[PDB]
Amino acid sequence: RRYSVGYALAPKKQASFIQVSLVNLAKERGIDLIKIDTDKPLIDQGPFDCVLHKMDGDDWKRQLKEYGSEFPQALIIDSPEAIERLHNRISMLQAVGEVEIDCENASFGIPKQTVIYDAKMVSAINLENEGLEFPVIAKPLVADGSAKSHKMLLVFNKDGLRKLKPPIVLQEFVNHGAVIFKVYVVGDYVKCVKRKSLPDVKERLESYLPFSQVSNDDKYYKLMNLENAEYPPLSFLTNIARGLRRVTKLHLFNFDVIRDDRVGNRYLIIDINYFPGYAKMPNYERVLTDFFWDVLNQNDKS
Ligand SMILES: Nc1ncnc2c1ncn2[C@@H]1O[C@H](COP(=O)(O)OP(=O)(O)O)[C@@H](O)[C@H]1O
Ligand SMILES: [Mg+2]
Ligand SMILES: [Mg+2]
Ligand SMILES: [Mg+2]
């Protein structure tokens, strides 16, 4: 009894994750959540049973390695190399190809994509020999959480390629009924929620369309409902989530799923993010508290 969890998170992540309910509920289960001062060497604090973190930069990486060398039995959530795979959008999706699950009901994968590094490479673009076709979507290569990294481009024809801002991933746009399925994972716990997405390109006035996250009224529109969109099968979502947990080596992540409406039963993972916002997930205090108990009780048992 009485495990300690040191946490190193940005101030806005502390405000949303470290709530009173979470602190107090973990404390009665015996989990002591302790704030890491990142302005002081990690190795000079604690020691902690577990280090939970979401910090950028090589020096934090240096400090984790330093810390884990002196306390090789402390659990690190999560491994910095595992987190780091999610920072380049090519390497981000590589784990999907390693997930092996029995599910002949439906297939899964990632959309076709190619990388455009600079201006010269835009000029050399040939979608055809890559098996790409227009409707493509250009995504910044680096997923660093900056505003820039979310600024995206829909390209409808040859012109509009001129609006690419490399380094970019060039990815086929998949008609998916205008709804993403965001799957949240905490260890073996799996929750899914629908969210609005881009409309289908009905195979207009522009050869490109930039869009982001912030993408008023007075212009008439009826907001489409997502009720009638079918969820992917529950068994498939949770088996893929737990396969991904095992391949990425990440305990806390979400991934975005779209259904490829061209086929019926093909699902594509288009995004995987480390340690997303959990504070409005129902019951998140008990789910996160039980997760810490489970992983600390597993690790303490070894
Ligand atoms: N291959 C694709 N086909 C169709 N829509 C896509 C595709 N990739 C991304 N999108 C749309 O763009 C949005 C952002 O893409 P995503 O890869 O999730 O970026 P971010 O990391 O900024 O969330 C998605 O929520 C989805 O609506
Ligand atoms: Mg400090
Ligand atoms: Mg996303
Ligand atoms: Mg993302």
Residue numbers in the entry: 8 to 210, 215 to 226, 234 to 320
What do the study authors state?
The synthesis of inositol pyrophosphates is mediated in plants by two classes of ATP-grasp fold kinase: PPIP5 kinases, known as VIH, and members of the inositol tris/tetrakisphosphate kinase (ITPK) family, specifically ITPK1/2. A molecular explanation of the contribution of ITPK1/2 to inositol pyrophosphate synthesis and turnover in plants is incomplete: the absence of nucleotide in published crystal structures limits the explanation of phosphotransfer reactions, and little is known of the affinity of potential substrates and competitors for ITPK1. Herein, we describe a complex of ADP and StITPK1 at 2.26 Å resolution and use a simple fluorescence polarization approach to compare the affinity of binding of diverse inositol phosphates, inositol pyrophosphates, and analogues. By simple HPLC, we reveal the novel catalytic capability of ITPK1 for different inositol pyrophosphates and show Ins(3,4,5,6)P4 to be a potent inhibitor of the inositol pyrophosphate-synthesizing activity of ITPK1.
Refined against all data to 2.26 Å resolution, the final structural model had an R-factor of 19.0% (Rfree 24.1%). Relative to AtITPK4, ITPK1 possesses a “tether” insertion following the central subdomain, while AtITPK4 possesses a “tab” in the N-terminal subdomain. The tether comprises a polypeptide connection between the C-terminal β-strand of the central domain and a helix of the C-terminal domain running under the protein. This polypeptide lies across the top of the active site cavity, linking the two domains. In all the ITPK1s of known molecular structure where this polypeptide is resolved, it provides residues that contribute to the ATP cofactor/substrate binding pocket. Consistent with the absence of the resolved nucleotide, this region is disordered in the crystal structure of ZmITPK1,38 but in StITPK1, it is stabilized in most parts by adventitious interactions with a neighboring copy of the molecule in the crystal lattice. As for other ITPK1 enzymes, the active site of StITPK1 is narrow, unlike the more open active site in AtITPK4, and features a highly positively charged active site. However, due to the lack of bound nucleotide in the crystal structure of ZmITPK1, the central domain is displaced relative to that seen in the potato enzyme structure and InsP6 binds in such a way that in-line phosphoryl transfer from the γ-phosphate of ATP is implausible. On the other hand, in the pose of InsP6 predicted for StITPK1, InsP6 binds with its “receiving” 5-phosphate in the F-specificity subsite, contrasting with the “receiving” 1-hydroxyl of Ins(3,4,5,6)P4 which occupies subsite A. Again, polar contacts to the ligand are made by Q224 of the tether region; thus, the bound nucleotide may stabilize the central subdomain and a portion of the tether, enabling recognition of InsP6 and catalysis.
